Amino acid sequence: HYGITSPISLAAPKETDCLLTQKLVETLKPFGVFEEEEELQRRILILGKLNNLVKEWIREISESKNLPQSVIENVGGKIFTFGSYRLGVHTKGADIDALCVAPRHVDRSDFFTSFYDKLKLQEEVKDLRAVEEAFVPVIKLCFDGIEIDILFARLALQTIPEDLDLRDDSLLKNLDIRCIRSLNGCRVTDEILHLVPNIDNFRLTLRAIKLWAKRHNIYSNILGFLGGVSWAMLVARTCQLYPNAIASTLVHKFFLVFSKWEWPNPVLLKQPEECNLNLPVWDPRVNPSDRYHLMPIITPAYPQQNSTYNVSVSTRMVMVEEFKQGLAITDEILLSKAEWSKLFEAPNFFQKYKHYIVLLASAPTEKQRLEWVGLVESKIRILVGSLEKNEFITLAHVNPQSFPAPKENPDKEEFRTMWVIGLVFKDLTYDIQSFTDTVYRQAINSKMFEVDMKIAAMHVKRKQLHQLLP
Ligand SMILES: Nc1ncnc2c1ncn2[C@@H]1O[C@H](COP(=O)(O)OP(=O)(O)OP(=O)(O)O)C[C@H]1O
Ligand SMILES: [Mn+2]
Ligand SMILES: [Mn+2]
């Protein structure tokens, strides 16, 4: 079997489950979780073009280096997709994450020079932008309407074989960290796909779980909840425990298993192996720092990492309760006492808590609003953190989805966004003011602050939350 433990059950579905699974599929369609076939075809064609461009570019580099016409004919090179698109659960509007793999004689500087310029002159390319200095260097672009994220890695091979498998740990041998980092995404996705007993059953279940998570305000890695990869690993673990089950049963078991999971026990998809390389590896036995993590979900490819180290007491507590409510609803569905539509109902967040904090961010232009909001979102856990230190707080629940905030100046156009944070109690002006000052200070010291960029927060009872949003 798959996984580090024996499965819970090997039982196959009954015709009863088959019909329940078909109903799940019908309930999901209206939400747009299934991309249209025509769009899927368009994306396939886009990838074919990119792949040929990569091959063409590498051939040119090979020739310009007077390499023997011997190698030139077989240097190869290709694009490897990873992430949501590769797992097949991407939704309308999602980008395509791809890794350009080239032989050793192709340098990173070439990727950002000759390849970049090749893309620049393609008719289908718009908004071409390079981010060479990021943790993971990338070239971003809009290709025929589809957003593409392209990473780069030059392997210690003279030629790139078509059957090259990136899961081989030896490939990381003494490579620059930028290359190692650029390879992790493809390796994690490929590992996941080879760690579940049935890919189709796994896929449908994940589509369901991701929609459920978003609809229940717990979808966001940045804010301390779970991101796409983390949800995929939890679904994968569930699949390993019920190898012959189909989607309707797997969705139900997903809530059974995780609502009862004993955190901080880690979620592992396979047994980790020890590798000589000196890369960061999550392991509480040898790293005391990892012992503090509250809800560990470990990536399966070396070097393994905790995909959810941002989880705090508040977010974990919120998600545990959501898993329990999810289980209850699926129990009803299995008894035909409720429809799948009830599981995807997005409760009114603006009513589940007695107290809230409203966070406002604004800028002089729409362009600056976008940049500002990104910066502020990355700091919100600082406020949550300080709130958890407050003797009167049980938890703070940040609704990951922000939205346009009401007007303030009726005479001029405004570019303002807002977040709503739910609170649970066992004066918050000092903690809020302290967080406000910190955001301004860090932004300014980072050279990422523009005049007139504002941020303000207020505490308000549920009843008065009414008079502060459309
Ligand atoms: N531009 C990027 N730079 C670095 N890592 C990336 C980038 N895009 C994706 N990844 C990595 O791949 C993981 C899986 O990607 P995926 O979940 O498909 O992207 P996503 O960010 O959810 O989608 P969107 O970018 O919103 O369309 C998430 C992250 O660890
Ligand atoms: Mn993506
Ligand atoms: Mn991306």
- Is residue 468 domain-resident? no
Number of domains in the chain: 3
Compute the distance between CA of residue 233 and CA of residue 269 in angstroms, rounded to an integer: 7
- Is residue 364 domain-resident? yes
Cβ–Cβ under 8 Å, residues 262 and 330: no
- Is residue 170 domain-resident? yes
Burial (CB < 10 A; 0-12, 13-18, 19+), residue 264, is middle
Last residue of one domain, picked from the residues 190, 208, 242: 190
Active-site residue 210, yes or no?
yes
Residue numbers belonging to the annotated binding site for ATP: 82-84, 91, 95-97, 149, 210, 219, 228-229
- Among candidate residues 97, 190, 290, 431, the one labeled active-site is 97
Considering Cα of 12, then 319, then 190, then 81, what sign does the dihedral take? Answer: positive
Q: What DSSP element (H or E) covers 234? A: helix 228-241
Inter-helix orientation angle 228-241/177-193, to 10°? 40
Q: Is there a cis peptide before residue 284, judged by omega within 30 degrees of 0?
A: no
- Resolution of the structure, angstroms: 2.2
The two beta strands, 146-154 and 96-102, are parallel
Residues 6+ positions from 15 with CB-CB distance below 8 Å: none
Compute the distance between CA of residue 303 and CA of residue 272 in angstroms, rounded to an integer: 9
- Among candidate residues 116, 219, 353, 356, the one labeled active-site is 219
Point out residues after which the chain has a gap (C–N over 2.5 Å).
Answer: 426
Residue 355 amino acid letter: H
> For the chain, first and last CA: distance in Å?
52
Q: In terms of Cα–Cα distance, which of 34, 74, 158, 59 is closest to 114?
A: 59
Domain that holds residue 398: 348-460
- Is residue 214 domain-resident? yes
Which neighbouring-strand residues pair with 154?
Answer: 102
| Ligand 1 close to Cβ of residue 185 (< 6 A) | yes
* Longest CA–CA separation in the chain, Å: 76
DSSP single-letter state for residue 15? H
Phi, psi of 419 (to 5 degrees): -120, 150
Q: Is there a cis peptide before residue 303, judged by omega within 30 degrees of 0?
A: yes
Are 256 and 111 part of one and the same domain? no
Active-site residue 219, yes or no?
yes
Are 329 and 196 part of one and the same domain? yes
Cβ–Cβ under 8 Å, residues 82 and 42: no
- Is residue 342 domain-resident? yes
Cβ–Cβ under 8 Å, residues 179 and 111: no
Q: Sheet containing 78-82: give its strands across.
A: 78-82, 96-102, 146-154, 138-143, 125-131
Q: What CATH number did the domain enclosing 237 receive?
A: 1.10.1410.10
Method: X-ray
Compute the distance between CA of residue 61 and CA of residue 52 in angstroms, rounded to an integer: 14
Q: In terms of Cα–Cα distance, which of 138, 140, 136, 130 is closest to 177?
A: 136
Compute the distance between CA of residue 241 and CA of residue 260 in angstroms, rounded to an integer: 14
Query: How far apart, in Å, are the Cα atoms of 110 and each of 148, 153, 373, 393?
Result: 19, 11, 33, 53
Are 184 and 248 part of one and the same domain? no
Structure token pair of residue 247: 């989607």
- Is residue 470 domain-resident? no
- Residue 467, Cα to own-chain centre: how many angstroms? 34
